[PDB]
Amino acid sequence: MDYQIDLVDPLTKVFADEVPDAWVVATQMVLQGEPLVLQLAYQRLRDDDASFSELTLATSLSAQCFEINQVPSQLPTWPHPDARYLRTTPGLFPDLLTPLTGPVRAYHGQVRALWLKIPTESLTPGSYELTITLTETASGQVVFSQTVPLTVAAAVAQPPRLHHTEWFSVDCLADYYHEAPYTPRLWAIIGNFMVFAHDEALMDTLLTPIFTPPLDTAVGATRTNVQLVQILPGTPYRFDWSRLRKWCQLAQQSGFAYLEMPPLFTQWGAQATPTITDTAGTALFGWHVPSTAPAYRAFLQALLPQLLAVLAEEGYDRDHLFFHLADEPNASTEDGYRAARAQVADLLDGLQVIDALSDVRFYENGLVPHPVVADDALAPFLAADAAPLWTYYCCAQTTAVPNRFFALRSYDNRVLGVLLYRHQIQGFLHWGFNFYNAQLSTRPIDPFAVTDAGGAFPSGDPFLVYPGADGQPLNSLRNEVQRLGFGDLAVLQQLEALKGRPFVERLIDVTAGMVPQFDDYPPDAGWLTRLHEKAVATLAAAAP
Amino acid sequence: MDYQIDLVDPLTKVFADEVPDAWVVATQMVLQGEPLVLQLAYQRLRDDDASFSELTLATSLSAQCFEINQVPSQLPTWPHPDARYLRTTPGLFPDLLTPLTGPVRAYHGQVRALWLKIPTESLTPGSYELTITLTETASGQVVFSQTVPLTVAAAVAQPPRLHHTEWFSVDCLADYYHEAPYTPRLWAIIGNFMVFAHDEALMDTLLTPIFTPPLDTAVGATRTNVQLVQILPGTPYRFDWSRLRKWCQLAQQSGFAYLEMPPLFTQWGAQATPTITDTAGTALFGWHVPSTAPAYRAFLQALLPQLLAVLAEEGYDRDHLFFHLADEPNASTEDGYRAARAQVADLLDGLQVIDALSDVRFYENGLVPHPVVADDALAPFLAADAAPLWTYYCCAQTTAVPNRFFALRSYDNRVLGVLLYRHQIQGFLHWGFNFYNAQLSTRPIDPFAVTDAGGAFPSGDPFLVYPGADGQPLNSLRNEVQRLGFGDLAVLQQLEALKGRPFVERLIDVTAGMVPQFDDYPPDAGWLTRLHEKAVATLAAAA
Amino acid sequence: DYQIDLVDPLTKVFADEVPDAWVVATQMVLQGEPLVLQLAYQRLRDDDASFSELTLATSLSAQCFEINQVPSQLPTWPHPDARYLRTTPGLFPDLLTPLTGPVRAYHGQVRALWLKIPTESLTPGSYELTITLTETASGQVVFSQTVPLTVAAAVAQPPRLHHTEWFSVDCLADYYHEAPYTPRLWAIIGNFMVFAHDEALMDTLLTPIFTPPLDTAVGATRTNVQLVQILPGTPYRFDWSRLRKWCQLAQQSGFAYLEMPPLFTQWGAQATPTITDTAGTALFGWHVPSTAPAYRAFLQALLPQLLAVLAEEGYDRDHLFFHLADEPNASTEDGYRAARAQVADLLDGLQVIDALSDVRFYENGLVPHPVVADDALAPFLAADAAPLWTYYCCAQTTAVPNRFFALRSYDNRVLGVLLYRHQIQGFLHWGFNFYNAQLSTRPIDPFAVTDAGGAFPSGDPFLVYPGADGQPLNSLRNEVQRLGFGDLAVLQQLEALKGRPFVERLIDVTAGMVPQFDDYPPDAGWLTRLHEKAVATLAAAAP
């Protein structure tokens, strides 16, 4: 009666001021390598003179444990929020994950939660009993004990097949951690952020600042310079490659199979050029030099043969590279995109060139052969059978479709996985791995205090990871939930290897009661848990 | 149509969550020098496709204007909150003030507020007409206009008389801005904070780190070293005053009349000494050297004559200095205070030594002749007619008494001023000007994200000011409200100059309906406004 | 032009203040349970008319009331705690009047409506309730709001609890100018009896067998309301016609229990009730001691005969409550013994109840069935006393539930969950309709004087007001207590489904603590959540 401690659904968001639903315990089954994921909520009902009481966690198998931290939001939603959104007004939302490194503090008058992962690659197949205990460190009384049966199947977890890039901001690390591009300490921090990106965020593709990306910048303004290709004073062009080389050695070592090149013109119109300097610091391109400048055709004609040469030397052939022209064109800016392409189409021969888009006309016009499409605009590109096809979401995908905002359900994030599968999407892109700026980079923000880009974007949009004091990225609930969805993709793919694709499509549709669509998926979240278990049971029932 | 915009009482806290009540415009009267202070709440009612619509602010007279910023709290109260507390669970609280440097953004679905002050120091006496307007930047249409009459008496606002110290942490600036003690950029930042403290927090007294203060430190741990007195290696003690000369020059140029020295012994038990090193970096004193160490007694017999001489050269004589023995002894540590006392008492003859208590018993013993007394513990000291008397408040003053927590009313902050007056308290001390650490300084915290010392202290306790990115302090609502309380104390002091004390005491009591006490003051704030008005009208009429 | 908003049912809307809005959320009710909303309104447009007229419509049948501002000159007793909303003489929202025409929206003042949507006749499902206000000059719509409503298939069961609010016939006599007992007085008594059972949720009625010895100055006489009449002369003959009348209206109005008045005088039990014969000659009263052998002989005659008449009216020994005298302390204890000893043998077999705040006198067996003040329950709960009742009155000013105009509506409704949590079998209040000054020195006008002539906090003495047509008018204090009772009912309905432990567990978890009578959560939202959870669980188990 002194404590209220309970396991909860991993898709619940635990708010400090409401008691959540208990998970009813049932036997679990995981492929060997697949972790078991639980969430545990807790408060101290005893009304004594101390604000909290210390508790000791124990597990009968090795686990990895996080505290879930409440973080502020001043703009949880954009206008006209639909009925999926949990809350709507400025408040606190759960998101940040800090490692558990001592006793847990159970507070009176408010609820808190832990994130628990039980790794399984060391476990010989068979049946287990997982006991979780909390002990009042002051008295040695055991206040919580819960046993969860865990079967580890003979079948090994395969990883998912999908291209995944979450845009990377080197300037945001420079500014936050107070380090000139590119000190040794900055290189160490970038390293840490890259290992997280590959291993924990399940990225195979990485944005590489060949020059400072012409992205999220105010007309006329300037992000901290992060160009990896450096250029000596002088008009016959001579390149210094040392930073690119070091960059690629760290990506390779961090596990990246692909690098993604920044856009060659400016966002939303392709009107100007990226802010490029020489080694003295003298601007050569920028907002004052239009896209159609002859000087910039000449700059690139020189650069592109040599740059591919350097990238191949570092283990990235033309089949392991993605290029961009300009980001997020629509009908208004059709002819800007056209005009800029015309300056450069003949230089990008045989390269894979992609761009993020909503308007199918750009694909039929052939301006954009390889489109990344908004997840509320997919239907016209499915009609036309475009392959390959990628998807993305951002501030603007507010209605009916998947997204990761603080004020939405975790289910709206996780449900991406099955939907990538069901509709044969090959890639997923997102602009905000680590954007710690106000809209249009007018100034830096503190990501622990501001999650809404300075009151411009719904919270949860601009960054997936927080910058730890030690230079190490801190995990988020949004990322751990995105992982569950990627683990859904991967078991469905593994199931398709054993049976039809037809078989898996029938099984998704029957478990949903419908063909799940990106803008129309079931209102209840329980069907995902049931698809995932069925998939896992069919692969186990069939293993040697 | 379209917007919803109203003036609100200065003592209202506007949540992003709720519409507050409108101030009914009355004529204001100010003595000359005294600012008019207003608050303005705002919201866009039109449900378009933009989240917000920019507005422009104009005033008839020069205003300093601030946007009021919502800040997170994970621990709004300690156990068993009384019913004065506004909210009692984790959420956002209005506290941080940022200069308004452009248009204001009126959002749909959420309320926001500005703090406005109209200086009066340059208006010649008379009747003015303060008009406040907001214009929609898109449509050039005016969507808010209110006019507040303002009278400026020929009578001049005199400043409050009272010792006030709010403990300063150099280690917290060093760590937040990532500057080693003591670089040129750290000196400039310290200066910025020192000028806010005097002019904007109304302090006359500054905590001066002769050595790193033995405060809020876990047994056996260490904060960044900020000691102003440097010791050269070797046993006939040679000292380097350079850091301390610089400190005192910035202190004096910022207007501080008094400096406060840190405790000579460790907090609570008084068991050990402060962490002092030499120029090579070698530990001379600390947790591993007891208070009763002959060496430490020797060190202070060398240090105290030489430091007094140097402070006097910086223009702080023995009657402008406060000294500390050990913070916060209680019944069970009483002997440790005695033992430490008896090592150094002979070296402190003719110095003003003070320490902070809740137990009256250390006063009854003569152990602490000059007590700083918790504001929920005053009654036995008032009765034992102790004088001089200072008071303080911290985490541990949760019930029935003045404090500044995010979750208490602004009233509970502002009332402090009349109560100092009424009960003849001579000083006010607070431990948290700018503590940007977790409890016991086990690590630094982000003061914009964490306001409760890592979930140990009710939010609004550990710091008064925030660290701006330019290196300048950012103001708080808590400070602005407490400045109103000092404004109350000032006019009542000025009124007692004209009539006696009995006259003023009598006006307080009749206006309140009762003799107001620290643990028993009227339920509604209105009476503070009426007494402020009464005392101003009377003073103006005498000019 | 207008400013119109749904507000929380627990909000008190003052004329001089805009209250916070209710964010619409899907409402779930059991079938039979009503949806209750409050609606605040004002005109912003500043024309030359003081008000403009509006028409209300609702897509479902609604029962609607205007909330009326009523005066108080004594809002609190001394030393009020911080829960008290206002504490000086003003106007307070309380009286409820049927809405018979259009709403008048005024400039410079806020007003409110109380809205109830019955549900007994909706078949289960999802509904959309639309609420609209339409300016009548201009035929346009100035407010529209849809609130979603699910009516479960699971049926709302009534609360289990004994509840009496003491009834004063003399106050109906005096106010409507009717001598006991005329045809028109009987009809007005019935109107009040019907409200009592059906609208105030009483199962028990105080029956004036003789004029109740309550609220009477020593040596005085309230109007004679005795239903039992006594022919003149010493071999005692009784006339039952007024009793039979009383009992029939009581039974037709739905009362299962009748409550007999105290046998001895208040505060000491020194003397006897003011009893006359039919000539008018006084047989008992202030002039006859309680030890008088005549009073015992009067009751040995009366009691067997009254029990027989009451059983004819359908009220047996298990459906009657008897009183002796209230509040034995160290003073009165000696004469309460004296008096008790004079009659105890006649009362064996009968349920005898009395007010008691000292547990010694329960243990003693001096008072077997105690009605305990809600600020004194701890020692009785410590002794597992059972059955146990509670009351509150002028004297329960601090930390505990009450009804006062100046308290939060929260502090009234919260009683429901606390009665459940602590297994309290019954609730008694003294003031159903006391329209007199203290000690019954004179009648008062209940629309103009709400504090018994400046004696008791306003909201204490009566729950209903007297309508011009001789029908009771409702009050907000009554509507809010009906919420509290609705909470108790769902919690009891849920205990039939799970057990008590499960329901205690949900109470404590939702509250974040074990709620006590003198220590319940700071904020009221936890009640709304608790009520929602209970209802969702009962709906889910229906087949």
Residue numbers in the entry:
A (entry chain D): 1 to 544
B (entry chain C): 1 to 543
C (entry chain B): 2 to 544
Relevant lines from the article:
Beta-N-acetylgalactosaminidases (β-NGAs) hydrolyze the different β-GalNAc linkages of various glycans to modulate the length, combination, and abundance of glycans. Despite low sequence similarity, the crystal structures of these enzymes demonstrate that all enzymes share a prototype structure and have diversified their substrate specificities (oligosaccharide-releasing, oligosaccharide/monosaccharide-releasing, and monosaccharide-releasing) through the accumulation of mutations and insertional amino acid sequences.
The structure of NgaDssm (Group 3) bore a striking resemblance to that of NgaLy and NgaP2 (Group 4) (root-mean-square distance of Cα atoms [rmsd] = 1.5–2.3 Å), while the structures of NgaLy and NgaP2 are identical (rmsd = 1.0 Å). Among the conserved amino acids, D95, W115, Y466, and R478 (amino acid numbers of NgaLy) are located at the interface between the N-terminal domain and DUF4091 (right). D95 and W115, located at the N-terminal domain, fit into the surface pocket of DUF4091, and the side chain of D95 formed hydrogen bonds with Y466 and R478 located at DUF4091. G427 is positioned at the entry point for the eighth β-sheet into the (β/α)8 barrel domain, with the space barely the size of the glycine residue. The DE motif (D327 and E328), Y392, and W431 are located around the substrate and are involved in substrate recognition (red letter). The Y392A and W431A mutants were purified as soluble enzymes (red letter), although their catalytic activity was considerably reduced. The Km and kcat of each enzyme for the most preferred substrate (GalNAc-β-pNP or Galβ1-3GalNAc-β-pNP) were also examined, wherein NgaLy possessed the highest kcat/Km value.
